[PDB]
Design an enzyme around this catalytic site. Sequence first.
Site, mmCIF file in Angstrom:
data_model
loop_
_atom_site.group_PDB
_atom_site.id
_atom_site.type_symbol
_atom_site.label_atom_id
_atom_site.label_comp_id
_atom_site.label_asym_id
_atom_site.label_seq_id
_atom_site.Cartn_x
_atom_site.Cartn_y
_atom_site.Cartn_z
ATOM 1 N N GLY A 1 -61.891 27.014 -19.957
ATOM 2 C CA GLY A 1 -61.639 27.765 -21.170
ATOM 3 C C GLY A 1 -60.340 27.407 -21.855
ATOM 4 O O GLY A 1 -60.240 27.503 -23.079
ATOM 5 N N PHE B 1 -68.246 25.218 -19.159
ATOM 6 C CA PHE B 1 -69.494 25.055 -18.436
ATOM 7 C C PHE B 1 -70.456 26.213 -18.651
ATOM 8 O O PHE B 1 -71.648 25.993 -18.909
ATOM 9 C CB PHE B 1 -69.259 24.923 -16.937
ATOM 10 C CG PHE B 1 -68.450 23.747 -16.538
ATOM 11 C CD1 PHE B 1 -69.076 22.586 -16.128
ATOM 12 C CD2 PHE B 1 -67.065 23.794 -16.578
ATOM 13 C CE1 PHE B 1 -68.350 21.483 -15.731
ATOM 14 C CE2 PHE B 1 -66.303 22.692 -16.175
ATOM 15 C CZ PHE B 1 -66.953 21.520 -15.751
ATOM 16 N N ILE C 1 -60.421 18.798 -14.843
ATOM 17 C CA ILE C 1 -60.227 17.409 -14.468
ATOM 18 C C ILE C 1 -59.683 16.591 -15.626
ATOM 19 O O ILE C 1 -59.620 15.360 -15.538
ATOM 20 C CB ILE C 1 -61.533 16.803 -13.932
ATOM 21 C CG1 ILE C 1 -62.700 17.053 -14.898
ATOM 22 C CG2 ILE C 1 -61.889 17.402 -12.582
ATOM 23 C CD1 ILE C 1 -62.754 16.137 -16.099
ATOM 24 N N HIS D 1 -59.848 20.411 -8.258
ATOM 25 C CA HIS D 1 -61.075 19.625 -8.303
ATOM 26 C C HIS D 1 -60.804 18.174 -8.647
ATOM 27 O O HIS D 1 -61.671 17.487 -9.186
ATOM 28 C CB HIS D 1 -62.022 20.255 -9.306
ATOM 29 C CG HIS D 1 -62.375 21.657 -8.964
ATOM 30 N ND1 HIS D 1 -62.862 22.539 -9.895
ATOM 31 C CD2 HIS D 1 -62.357 22.320 -7.786
ATOM 32 C CE1 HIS D 1 -63.124 23.692 -9.306
ATOM 33 N NE2 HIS D 1 -62.832 23.584 -8.025
ATOM 34 N N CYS E 1 -63.679 3.416 -4.838
ATOM 35 C CA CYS E 1 -64.955 3.033 -4.254
ATOM 36 C C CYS E 1 -65.363 4.046 -3.189
ATOM 37 O O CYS E 1 -64.522 4.692 -2.557
ATOM 38 C CB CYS E 1 -64.874 1.634 -3.648
ATOM 39 S SG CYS E 1 -66.315 1.220 -2.668
ATOM 40 N N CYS F 1 -64.162 0.459 2.182
ATOM 41 C CA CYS F 1 -63.721 -0.183 0.952
ATOM 42 C C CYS F 1 -62.654 0.643 0.246
ATOM 43 O O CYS F 1 -61.471 0.288 0.276
ATOM 44 C CB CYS F 1 -64.925 -0.432 0.039
ATOM 45 S SG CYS F 1 -64.643 -1.567 -1.322
ATOM 46 N N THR G 1 -61.111 30.986 -17.289
ATOM 47 C CA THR G 1 -61.963 30.724 -16.139
ATOM 48 C C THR G 1 -62.830 31.943 -15.870
ATOM 49 O O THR G 1 -62.381 33.079 -16.038
ATOM 50 C CB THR G 1 -61.156 30.399 -14.877
ATOM 51 O OG1 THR G 1 -62.057 30.087 -13.805
ATOM 52 C CG2 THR G 1 -60.289 31.585 -14.474
ATOM 53 N N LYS H 1 -61.778 35.118 -22.878
ATOM 54 C CA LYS H 1 -62.678 35.746 -23.837
ATOM 55 C C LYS H 1 -63.377 36.979 -23.261
ATOM 56 O O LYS H 1 -63.850 37.834 -24.020
ATOM 57 C CB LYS H 1 -63.745 34.754 -24.284
ATOM 58 C CG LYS H 1 -63.344 33.762 -25.354
ATOM 59 C CD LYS H 1 -64.559 32.899 -25.674
ATOM 60 C CE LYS H 1 -64.431 32.132 -26.975
ATOM 61 N NZ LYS H 1 -65.659 31.303 -27.191
HETATM 62 NA NA NA Z 1 -62.923 23.458 -14.999
HETATM 63 ZN ZN ZN Z 2 -66.071 -1.056 -3.088
#
Ligand code: NA
Ligand code: ZN
Lengths: 291, 289
Positions: A30, A40, A113, A131, A139, A144, A206, A231
């Site tokens: 938010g 979301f 994010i 998150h 990778c 790796c 949130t 909100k």
């Molecule tokens: Na979020």
């Molecule tokens: Zn890789």
Amino acid sequence: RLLDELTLEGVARYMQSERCRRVICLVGAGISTSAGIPDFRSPSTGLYDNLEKYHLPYPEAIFEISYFKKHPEPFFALAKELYPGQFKPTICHYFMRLLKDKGLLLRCYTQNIDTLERIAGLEQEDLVEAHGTFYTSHCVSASCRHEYPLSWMKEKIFSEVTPKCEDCQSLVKPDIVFFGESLPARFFSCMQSDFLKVDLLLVMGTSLQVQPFASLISKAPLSTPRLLINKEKAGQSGLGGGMDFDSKKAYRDVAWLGECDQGCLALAELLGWKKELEDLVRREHASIDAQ
Amino acid sequence: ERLLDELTLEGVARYMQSERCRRVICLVGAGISTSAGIPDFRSPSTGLYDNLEKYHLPYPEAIFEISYFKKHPEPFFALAKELYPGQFKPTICHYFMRLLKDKGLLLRCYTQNIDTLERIAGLEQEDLVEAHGTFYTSHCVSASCRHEYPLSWMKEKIFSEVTPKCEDCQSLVKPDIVFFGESLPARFFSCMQSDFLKVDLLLVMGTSLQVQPFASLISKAPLSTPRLLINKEKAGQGGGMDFDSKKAYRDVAWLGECDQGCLALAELLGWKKELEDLVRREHASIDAQ
Ligand code: NA
Ligand SMILES: [Zn+2]
Ligand code: NA
Ligand code: NA
Ligand code: NA
Ligand SMILES: [Zn+2]
């Protein structure tokens, strides 16, 4: 109770008090919609309501690690569509910037994010990106794990060329915590430390519907005031703590309903910071439009 | 095994035309009456919680608490006077549940509203569980008096702004609504033990499902019984509502106005013409005194 009135004015009076020395911010999607990134769970505009052109078995699949491992194309189509032309932090991010500059910000736990908290000037010490982030990628192979910068990934995402490791041709995913991945160890360590000393909780944009994040509002001492700028009321009563704005025993929780930027402006004015907040937002927005 | 072929309004309507769907339970709340001009409680800005300033209550919930009402009844009756709806005209949603009664599909309507619009739409008492009571009848509060008073009496006392006090014992006469702290009617529980053993479909409409024990009713339903929500926003998230996870199998959320969702559902069922006709006729009949 530390607050004299269960209002925004009460919270601002408290923030001017001497005992209010460490503020924790809990923020969610938010606080970024003003920057053009949709949330979301808002109906109609939310991501859950606009995921039909991806042809998913279920809406959440696009966020599930296992599904991403078997069909990553949709997640990256979404990443390309949602890449923000300009990563411009909002008035809310810069209000957290003011809290840092006045020595009040102990931590900002973020569920987003988008890294807008970094662009607003919060440092890694100041942040728990619960998150993860899109800033760096890795990778997926246990042997790796080659890292890749945002430039590389961005080029691949916009070229609709599925990110594959150069050496092992595996899948390279932004360091986000998809459903089914564990939270960073920082989340738990910082939590155990920060919530013993917190004096004020600032919950913004949130819905507190995803655990283990929402339970954070329950770890605070029973005396720590909690202000929600959102909100709509959230965190009441899945949940373990309990926001109580309206019952007969309510004593410390305050809900200011409306836009996150508008609530930050009102709060700043109450504290005599509205002028500095508008000036800071102006300067930084102008400075960013130079790169 | 997923009695619904697809988690949509179309899937739910297909199920409803099927043979297996013979018993529908409706769980409804203030949201189904906002079109009739009665506002809800927890909507931001327009809800009752956001507009209780002029009553000078110690806390927002006090206006609905039995104890506060018994010691400070003036604010509740001021709210009753100002909230008394000039015309009691049920919404398209009420009449869609009337369509459910007429087609033999309605096992019960569990309502949280006190406005009795379900009766005016033509549901009978055997059709209804008014879980939080009604404004239609009132009683003196003394455990040994319990003298009943009809709505004419109450309407007159509320509008003349004289706190209703019993003629015989001079105690407080309150409407038969279920205030916070009063027990629910026994009908709720009886009807529950029976209705949720044979129910084939759950229709949750205009409710936030944030008040217990009403909200837990979605848990009494068999695990196979589909559950469709018609509401401005997801709510209720046996079990809880699972609309979006990999394990979702029976829950469908149609977000929007309750009247529009009833219209779309009826159309899928081929009742839209009849629903609109019924709404027009009943509105005209009530306006004709
Ligand atoms: Na979020
Ligand atoms: Zn890789
Ligand atoms: Na929401
Ligand atoms: Na709501
Ligand atoms: Na479930
Ligand atoms: Zn009496």
